[PDB]
Amino acid sequence: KTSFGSLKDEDRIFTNLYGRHDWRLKGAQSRGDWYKTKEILLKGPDWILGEVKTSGLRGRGGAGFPTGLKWSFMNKPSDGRPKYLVVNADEGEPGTCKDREIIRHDPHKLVEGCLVGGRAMGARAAYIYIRGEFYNEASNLQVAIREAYEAGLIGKNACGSGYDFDVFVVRGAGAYICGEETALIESIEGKQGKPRLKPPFPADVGVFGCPTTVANVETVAVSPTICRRGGAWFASFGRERNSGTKLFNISGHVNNPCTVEEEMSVPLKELIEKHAGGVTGGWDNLLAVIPGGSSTPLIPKSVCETVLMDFDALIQAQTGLGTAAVIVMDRSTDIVKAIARLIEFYKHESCGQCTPCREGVDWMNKVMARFVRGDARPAEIDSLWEISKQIEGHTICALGDGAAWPVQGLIRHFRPELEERMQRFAQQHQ
Amino acid sequence: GWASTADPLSNLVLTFSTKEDAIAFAEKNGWSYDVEERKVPKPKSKSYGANFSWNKRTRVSTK
Amino acid sequence: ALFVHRDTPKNNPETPFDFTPENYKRIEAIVKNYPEGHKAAAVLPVLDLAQRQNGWLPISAMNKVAEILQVPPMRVYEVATFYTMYNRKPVGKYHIQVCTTTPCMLRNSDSILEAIQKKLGIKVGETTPDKLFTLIEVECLGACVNAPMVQINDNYYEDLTPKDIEEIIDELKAGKIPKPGPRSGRFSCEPAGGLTSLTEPPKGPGFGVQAGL
Ligand SMILES: NC(=O)C1=CN([C@@H]2O[C@H](COP(=O)(O)OP(=O)(O)OC[C@H]3O[C@@H](n4cnc5c(N)ncnc54)[C@H](O)[C@@H]3O)[C@@H](O)[C@H]2O)C=CC1
Ligand SMILES: Cc1cc2nc3c(=O)[nH]c(=O)nc-3n(C[C@H](O)[C@H](O)[C@H](O)COP(=O)(O)O)c2cc1C
Ligand code: SF4
Ligand code: FES
8 A cells, every 4th residue: 555545434533523422421332432341451461562562553642652662661560659541631732732622522532541551551540631721621521530430430340340440630730841741740749840851761750659651642542442443453554653543633824724533644735635625825825834733843835745744754854743733834924933933932831940941942032033023144043053953952851852943944944034034134224 | 467477388288199109208308297088978879760759758849 | 920929918928818618628639639648749739729719829828738738838839830820910800811822823813812902901911900801822722723712711712803802802791601612613623614524423332343352
């Protein structure tokens, strides 16, 4: 199979994504949820891990780490401490709104994924860390958890399998840095949401010092479907090491901004022109696309023609898949102002613990503000490139890389526009 | 109001690589001397994972 | 926007504050959600509950949280100052937050911001003289495909136009709470031009189950 896309409705994991059916237990149970869960819980942890790692599922958070190895890191005998599965439902990355849909419309899929994942690695409980702004989504999740508890699906003797498992929901307080896994762990513990240093990895020391595995909502909600349908069915879609389906949020200067599930190796042009109704003013009006939210470098129109939205082909286009959040900017957009707003967002959302991000991101914010005004010189463009290279790779967490990358992409693909801006400011203001 | 002195050896500081060279230099010049042993810091046990202990008192209240 | 505290008659450590008994039971449930020996993990939800009861956080809820959780007050001060959802100043009854991040900026959110500004007669970061509205500008709120959008307290108002946000403000001034949803034709996140996916009925239980399970 060389061409990918045009996924049928029978192969979609996230049915009732748009909320057109019942989100409660009665409607979810008629859609295949909570079916034969006792069999998966009784087939052992290693069988679940083998089913996960045969499908080749990679982490949907944005790092793209393989899920089977990451989950099997906690398949070790316990030393008296409990083990915890922690679900990252923060979703603070701009352009990304898939986890809100998953929580709001399919909560029982998330609960079943929590139970199956906790059985796969011997977790004592589950801690769902939802965004603090998602009050209604958190209340819907609490209602569904109550319905699952009252039906005997979780709790003491969960699903009649002899396994004890609790699901908890913890609400955040409005911090984008708390989406980082170690910062999430620190925020659950009642501290400031500042990330830790690795090693120790969360499988060794995590929440409360216990072994902990932090997993995304999307990579958890698909696990019962993986164990039920099979790993080969999930691996039948996408390329090598890019298996399965993916939720895309198409937004920006597009006709129909929407969230839609699609095959992993779908072309970007086909995805945009099919699901979102095309960009405004036709395909020739496209100017730039950010494929993975604000943490990924942007690509111009000449690259989006022949690119595929998986991990490897987007890596080879010197960008990343990210969270599969496609932000589209047409020719009526100031690209410098958009990237400056992104850097301003990164300056506002930065924990300030470690030196290079804390100083340098504000430095880049000031430099890009002067770039938007045009009050600079090309020597400052090369200086900003060097500063971005100095920030990246020298920080505790990956927010510094996520703030360095968009500037590098903007410089690399739109240096003539910036130079024209500063030269017209110099010739107008003097 | 300046600081006046009558001691020519007030600013005399001599540097030696090892203790025995200093001892021999002092004994050669007829100076009664005293020797203080070198104090070195003993090695510590440093662990970043001790800040998040499950049941020990070495947890940090903040970071 | 100051991260130091100065004593005022309105905000002093002698300002009266205490939880209601039902809130004490809720605090007990929150504490019971956590392992023993790690009672300090409940600093965030109890502080949020105090803000929900009071509407803002003077320096009497912080000390009360430190007292009922046996944690130092400095840790509660750090928690309150780090996160942006906690209000250390008294905001109005309706706290309007307008997202101006780039996916919302591309869909003309500044038009919504200036619409709110000329409807309320204030600017960003200010409060109406009758203490009913507060207008601030925030980062992304996880509704980027429904841009432009605002958040009023717990509710999300999405796909807004200047006329729609003016209608929301006028209805809020009358005392009635609007429906927290997109004001366009779509319901939650579907494409406006019909359903391009998930148009079939779901297959149901036992569909595609592998053998041996
Ligand atoms: N989803 C979102 O909202 C956002 C996603 N991102 C993306 O997230 C990524 C950065 O996130 P991180 O988790 O910090 O980076 P990633 O490099 O570290 O690590 C992913 C996971 O693999 C584990 N891991 C990796 N190597 C390991 C080893 N040798 N031993 C044990 N565990 C190991 C880590 O513990 C972590 O849980 C970037 O790709 C960025 O684009 C960035 C911003 C927002
Ligand atoms: C600044 C920052 C913010 C992040 N925010 C989120 C987030 O909101 N949701 C998420 O799932 N992962 C987020 N991540 C990625 C996590 O560190 C981690 O990779 C993820 O929670 C679990 O990865 P997985 O998809 O393999 O399960 C963020 C990372 C960084 C550096
Ligand atoms: S890179 Fe920035 S957000 Fe990340 S640990 Fe350092 S200061 Fe905090
Ligand atoms: S960019 Fe405004 S809700 Fe995400």
